[PDB]
Design an enzyme around this catalytic site. Structure first.
Site, PDB file in Angstrom:
ATOM      1  N   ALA A  35       0.807  -1.223   0.000  1.00 18.06           N
ATOM      2  CA  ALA A  35       0.000   0.000   0.000  1.00 18.06           C
ATOM      3  C   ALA A  35       0.838   1.269   0.000  1.00 18.06           C
ATOM      4  CB  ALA A  35      -0.931   0.001   1.201  1.00 18.06           C
ATOM      5  N   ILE A  37       3.181   2.161  -1.834  1.00 19.90           N
ATOM      6  CA  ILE A  37       3.504   2.761  -3.123  1.00 19.90           C
ATOM      7  C   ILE A  37       2.319   3.501  -3.746  1.00 19.90           C
ATOM      8  CG2 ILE A  37       5.199   0.894  -3.522  1.00 19.90           C
ATOM      9  CD1 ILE A  37       3.427   0.046  -5.988  1.00 19.90           C
ATOM     10  N   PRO A  44      -5.287   5.895   0.349  1.00 22.77           N
ATOM     11  CA  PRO A  44      -4.742   5.478   1.642  1.00 22.77           C
ATOM     12  C   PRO A  44      -4.787   3.974   1.809  1.00 22.77           C
ATOM     13  CG  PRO A  44      -6.708   6.852   1.932  1.00 22.77           C
ATOM     14  CD  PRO A  44      -6.596   6.557   0.477  1.00 22.77           C
ATOM     15  N   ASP A  45      -3.957   3.469   2.715  1.00 22.96           N
ATOM     16  CA  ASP A  45      -3.924   2.056   3.018  1.00 22.96           C
ATOM     17  C   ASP A  45      -5.098   1.736   3.922  1.00 22.96           C
ATOM     18  OD1 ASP A  45      -1.482  -0.082   4.758  1.00 22.96           O
ATOM     19  OD2 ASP A  45      -3.398  -0.529   3.811  1.00 22.96           O
ATOM     20  N   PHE A  46      -6.031   0.914   3.458  1.00 25.90           N
ATOM     21  CA  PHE A  46      -7.248   0.734   4.236  1.00 25.90           C
ATOM     22  C   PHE A  46      -6.950  -0.132   5.455  1.00 25.90           C
ATOM     23  CE2 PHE A  46      -8.333  -3.647   3.421  1.00 25.90           C
ATOM     24  CZ  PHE A  46      -7.835  -3.922   2.158  1.00 25.90           C
ATOM     25  N   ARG A  47      -5.766  -0.740   5.480  1.00 28.31           N
ATOM     26  CA  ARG A  47      -5.305  -1.490   6.653  1.00 28.31           C
ATOM     27  C   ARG A  47      -4.677  -0.624   7.752  1.00 28.31           C
ATOM     28  NH1 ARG A  47      -4.258  -5.402   2.612  1.00 28.31           N
ATOM     29  NH2 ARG A  47      -5.136  -7.462   3.124  1.00 28.31           N
ATOM     30  N   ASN A 114      -1.615  -4.765  -3.648  1.00 26.98           N
ATOM     31  CA  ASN A 114      -2.602  -3.704  -3.894  1.00 26.98           C
ATOM     32  C   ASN A 114      -3.696  -4.140  -4.855  1.00 26.98           C
ATOM     33  OD1 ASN A 114      -0.946  -2.145  -2.273  1.00 26.98           O
ATOM     34  ND2 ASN A 114      -0.059  -0.960  -3.961  1.00 26.98           N
ATOM     35  N   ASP A 116      -5.691  -1.734  -6.408  1.00 27.43           N
ATOM     36  CA  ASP A 116      -6.093  -0.466  -7.049  1.00 27.43           C
ATOM     37  C   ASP A 116      -5.890  -0.351  -8.564  1.00 27.43           C
ATOM     38  OD1 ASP A 116      -3.280  -0.041  -7.335  1.00 27.43           O
ATOM     39  OD2 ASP A 116      -3.196   1.034  -5.421  1.00 27.43           O
ATOM     40  N   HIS A 133      -3.139 -10.356  -3.741  1.00 31.19           N
ATOM     41  CA  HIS A 133      -4.402 -10.169  -3.045  1.00 31.19           C
ATOM     42  C   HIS A 133      -5.610 -10.053  -3.973  1.00 31.19           C
ATOM     43  CE1 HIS A 133      -2.410  -8.947   1.011  1.00 31.19           C
ATOM     44  NE2 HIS A 133      -2.073 -10.155   0.591  1.00 31.19           N
ATOM     45  N   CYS A 141     -18.904 -13.663 -12.142  1.00 32.69           N
ATOM     46  CA  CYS A 141     -20.104 -14.305 -11.624  1.00 32.69           C
ATOM     47  C   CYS A 141     -19.703 -15.406 -10.637  1.00 32.69           C
ATOM     48  CB  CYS A 141     -20.917 -14.884 -12.781  1.00 32.69           C
ATOM     49  SG  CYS A 141     -22.227 -16.002 -12.251  1.00 32.69           S
ATOM     50  N   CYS A 167     -25.108 -11.135 -12.585  1.00 34.08           N
ATOM     51  CA  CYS A 167     -24.689 -11.700 -13.855  1.00 34.08           C
ATOM     52  C   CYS A 167     -25.784 -11.639 -14.905  1.00 34.08           C
ATOM     53  CB  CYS A 167     -24.259 -13.146 -13.649  1.00 34.08           C
ATOM     54  SG  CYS A 167     -23.747 -13.946 -15.157  1.00 34.08           S
ATOM     55  N   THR A 208       5.801  -1.794   1.705  1.00 36.15           N
ATOM     56  CA  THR A 208       5.148  -2.864   2.452  1.00 36.15           C
ATOM     57  C   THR A 208       5.917  -3.189   3.737  1.00 36.15           C
ATOM     58  OG1 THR A 208       4.492  -5.224   2.393  1.00 36.15           O
ATOM     59  CG2 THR A 208       6.340  -4.551   0.986  1.00 36.15           C
ATOM     60  N   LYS A 233       8.967   3.555   4.517  1.00 35.60           N
ATOM     61  CA  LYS A 233       9.050   4.566   5.565  1.00 35.60           C
ATOM     62  C   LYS A 233       9.752   4.034   6.814  1.00 35.60           C
ATOM     63  CE  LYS A 233       5.272   7.648   4.452  1.00 35.60           C
ATOM     64  NZ  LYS A 233       4.062   8.341   4.975  1.00 35.60           N
ATOM     65  N   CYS A 263       8.368   6.115  -0.835  1.00 35.22           N
ATOM     66  CA  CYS A 263       8.766   5.268  -1.970  1.00 35.22           C
ATOM     67  C   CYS A 263       9.120   6.096  -3.215  1.00 35.22           C
ATOM     68  CB  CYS A 263       7.657   4.275  -2.309  1.00 35.22           C
ATOM     69  SG  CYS A 263       7.335   3.070  -1.002  1.00 35.22           S
TER      70      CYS A 263
HETATM   71  C1  LIG Z   1     -13.586   0.410  -5.073  1.00 28.79           C
HETATM   72  C2  LIG Z   1     -12.154   0.464  -5.610  1.00 28.79           C
HETATM   73  C3  LIG Z   1     -11.894   0.172  -6.938  1.00 28.79           C
HETATM   74  C4  LIG Z   1     -10.589   0.228  -7.407  1.00 28.79           C
HETATM   75  C5  LIG Z   1     -10.251  -0.082  -8.863  1.00 28.79           C
HETATM   76  N1  LIG Z   1      -9.642   0.558  -6.551  1.00 28.79           N
HETATM   77  C6  LIG Z   1      -9.927   0.827  -5.290  1.00 28.79           C
HETATM   78  S1  LIG Z   1      -8.570   1.286  -4.168  1.00 28.79           S
HETATM   79  C7  LIG Z   1      -9.268   2.154  -2.719  1.00 28.79           C
HETATM   80  C8  LIG Z   1      -9.694   1.156  -1.636  1.00 28.79           C
HETATM   81  O1  LIG Z   1      -9.051   1.025  -0.648  1.00 28.79           O
HETATM   82  N2  LIG Z   1     -10.903   0.382  -1.881  1.00 28.79           N
HETATM   83  C9  LIG Z   1     -11.459  -0.611  -0.984  1.00 28.79           C
HETATM   84  C10 LIG Z   1     -12.571  -1.287  -1.460  1.00 28.79           C
HETATM   85  C11 LIG Z   1     -13.179  -2.251  -0.680  1.00 28.79           C
HETATM   86  C12 LIG Z   1     -12.678  -2.528   0.574  1.00 28.79           C
HETATM   87  S2  LIG Z   1     -13.472  -3.803   1.577  1.00 28.79           S
HETATM   88  C13 LIG Z   1     -12.575  -5.333   1.172  1.00 28.79           C
HETATM   89  C14 LIG Z   1     -11.221  -5.280   0.860  1.00 28.79           C
HETATM   90  C15 LIG Z   1     -10.543  -6.447   0.548  1.00 28.79           C
HETATM   91  C16 LIG Z   1     -11.205  -7.662   0.552  1.00 28.79           C
HETATM   92  C17 LIG Z   1     -12.552  -7.710   0.867  1.00 28.79           C
HETATM   93  C18 LIG Z   1     -13.234  -6.547   1.168  1.00 28.79           C
HETATM   94  C19 LIG Z   1     -11.566  -1.859   1.058  1.00 28.79           C
HETATM   95  C20 LIG Z   1     -10.951  -0.896   0.274  1.00 28.79           C
HETATM   96  N3  LIG Z   1     -11.156   0.792  -4.805  1.00 28.79           N
HETATM   97 ZN   LIG Z   2     -23.485 -16.072 -14.233  1.00 29.61          ZN
END
Ligand SMILES: Cc1cc(C)nc(SCC(=O)Nc2ccc(Sc3ccccc3)cc2)n1
Ligand SMILES: [Zn+2]
Length: 295
Positions: A35, A37, A44-47, A114, A116, A133, A141, A167, A208, A233, A263
């Protein structure tokens, strides 16, 4: 070998790594990224606790990650996806440094934690990438007898229209290809790791903390002689004295180098040592302009 034998790095510094990279001994580079990078790209890093995900989320907060919960209650996930959907996807200097590695014929693989899709936007192709990940780039589907694949453009529309994605063939739930808690990592991760770490001359570990398994344990798959540069960092990858790993600082340290900071700044410093700074500047400015100009 270990500290017992003649080391490939002439000194353990960014400067030593650069000289190694431009010698004949360094041909294939594996990147391991996380995250750290994407934060300068505005994601932001959702973790990380500071990001405040759980404040935005107010049964239990963790349910948002669980595949079992998702399948019977998908609506929270897709609402959150809309809320957290990046307003722009503009890869960082770090991402484009990896594109430069590809252009220079040095990139064996980029393993990313990541979701993203910034590695793809920056010009790494599918063969170059192991998304450990999973990713939002494609969705499927969830019906085993269908598994119809959908592009992000499709999933995005459903996300912003606030329609739960279903679907078109069978009307089953369509799930982004990210790994939910309760799911195994992609098979691709394991098959690629087995081949790639036989071939690796340099491990570039960026943005990381190497706390999440199995991804973290990748650094132990490197041959004993393979130098490992951490750009982060804070220092990471060292063995837990309570429970080998990185050795940057000991009297036995022969291959591992820590460059501490952002980074982007570390990658900029390395590029400058390599004589790549203009190339990187030119690439980033061009691609950033192009992305900003998307109409
Ligand atoms: C919705 C989206 C689409 C794309 C292409 N990139 C992103 S990056 C931003 C971000 O952190 N999104 C994000 C989206 C969903 C979740 S919840 C979750 C995360 C991993 C596994 C299961 C559930 C946690 C974070 N976010
Ligand atoms: Zn289907």
């Amino acid at each position: 070998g270990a500290s017992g034998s003649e080391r490939l790095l002439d000194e353990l510094t960014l400067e030593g790594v650069a000289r190694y990279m431009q010698s004949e001994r360094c041909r294939r580079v594996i990147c391991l990224v996380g995250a750290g990078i994407s934060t300068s790209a505005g994601i932001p890093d959702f973790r990380s606790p500071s990001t405040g995900l759980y404040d935005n989320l107010e049964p239990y907060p963790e349910a948002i990650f669980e595949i079992s919960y998702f399948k019977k209650h998908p609506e929270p996930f897709f609402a959150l996806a809309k809320e957290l959907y990046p307003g722009q996807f503009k890869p960082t200097i770090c991402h484009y440094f990896m594109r430069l590695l590809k252009d220079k014929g040095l990139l064996l693989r980029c393993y990313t934690q990541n979701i993203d899709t910034l590695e793809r936007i920056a010009g790494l192709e599918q063969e170059d990438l192991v998304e450990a990940h999973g990713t939002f780039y494609t969705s499927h589907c969830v019906s085993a007898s269908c598994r119809h694949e959908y592009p992000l453009s499709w999933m995005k529309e459903k996300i912003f229209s606030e329609v739960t994605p279903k679907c078109e063939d069978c009307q089953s739930l369509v799930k982004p290809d990210i790994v939910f808690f309760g799911e195994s990592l992609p098979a691709r991760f394991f098959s690629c790791m087995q081949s790639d770490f036989l071939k690796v001359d340099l491990l570039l570990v960026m943005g990381t903390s190497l706390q999440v398994q199995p991804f973290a344990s990748l650094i132990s798959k490197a041959p004993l002689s393979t130098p490992r540069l951490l750009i982060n960092k804070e220092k990471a990858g060292q063995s837990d004295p309570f429970l080998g790993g990185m050795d940057f600082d000991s009297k036995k340290a022969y291959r591992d180098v820590a460059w501490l900071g952002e980074c982007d700044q570390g990658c900029l410093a390395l590029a400058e040592l390599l004589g790549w700074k203009k190339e990187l500047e030119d690439l980033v400015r061009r691609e950033h302009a192009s992305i900003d100009a998307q109409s």
